[PDB]
Design a protein around this ligand. Sequence first.
Ligand SMILES: COc1n[nH]c2ncc(C#Cc3c(F)ccc(NS(=O)(=O)c4cccc(Br)c4)c3F)cc12
Length: 291
Amino acid sequence: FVQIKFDDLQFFENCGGGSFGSVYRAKWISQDKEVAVKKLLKIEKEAEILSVLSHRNIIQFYGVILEPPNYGIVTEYASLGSLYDYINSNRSEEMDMDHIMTWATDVAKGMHYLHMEAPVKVIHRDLKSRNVVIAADGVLKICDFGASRFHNHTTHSLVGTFPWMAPEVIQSLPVSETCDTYSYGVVLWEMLTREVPFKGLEGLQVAWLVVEKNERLTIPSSCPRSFAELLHQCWEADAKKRPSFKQIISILESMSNDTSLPDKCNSFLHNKAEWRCEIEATLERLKKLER
Ligand SMILES: COc1n[nH]c2ncc(C#Cc3c(F)ccc(NS(=O)(=O)c4cccc(Br)c4)c3F)cc12
C-alpha cells in the first residue's frame, strides 16, 4: 500500500470536475510515470488486499493518496483509452478476426486471473467495455475490479450499465463468478457488431426485457456459428450453465484452430452495412413494443 503524495502528482485535467469514481490522467512526478488517479470519498485500509493483484490483463496498482479530503487510487495509464471509445469510433473498422480473438483472449485471461489465480478471489460485477482499456502495445487491461467491494459508491448511471448486467445482478439474487461471464459476452458482442448494446432503450426497459423475457442482444444471422454459440453460452439465464473463464479460453483456442473461421468472420465483420439493419430492426421493435 504505497502512499503517493497529492503534491507528487501533476494532473492533466482538473480533478475537481468529476463525481467520485472519476479517473484523471496525471504524471507521477518523482517516478516520471504517467498514471491514472481515481477520486474517492475515502480509502479503507483494508483495500490493501487488492494492492498485490498483478496480471498483464488487469490495470496495475501503483499507490494511494491519503490526504483528506483528497483520497484516491493511482494505477498505470493505458495510453490508447477505453475499449468502449475505440469500438464506437470509426477506428474499429481496422479490426479483423485475429484482432477480436486476441482481445477476447486478453479479457478472458484477466478475468480468469481475478476469479481463480489471484491471492483473493475477485468477482468484478461491473465488467463492461468502458471498464477495459487499451495499453500502448494493444494489450487490454481490466479496470474497476475492486469497486464492487471497496468503493461501491463509485459504481452508483446504473441505467447505463443494464446492458452489461447479468439477470441475477439486476435482481440482487445469489451471484456467482459467472455474472462476469454474462458481462463478457456483452463485451464480445460489442467487438463483433461495434454497436452500443440496446442503443437508445431506457435502462429499466432493458433490465425488464433481460430478466423477465429472456431477451438478449441480436446476433446477426451471418455471425459465425462459433461466435454465436459462445455468446449464447455466456448469456444463459441459469448462471450455473454459463462457462467459466477457463472454459471460454479453451473455446477461443479451439476457434483459433478452425481454418474456416478467419474467412467467415472477416467476411462477417466487413459486412456491417448488410447486417446492421437486423440490429436496428430489433431496436425499432423493442421501442415500439414499449409504446
Ligand atoms: C479512458 O480512460 C482510461 N484510458 N486509459 C486508462 N488507463 C487507466 C484508467 C484507470 C484506472 C483506475 C484507477 F485510476 C484507480 C482504480 C482502478 N480500478 S480499481 O478501483 O478496481 C483498483 C485497481 C487496482 C488496485 C486497487 Br486497490 C483498486 C482503475 F481502474 C483509465 C483509463
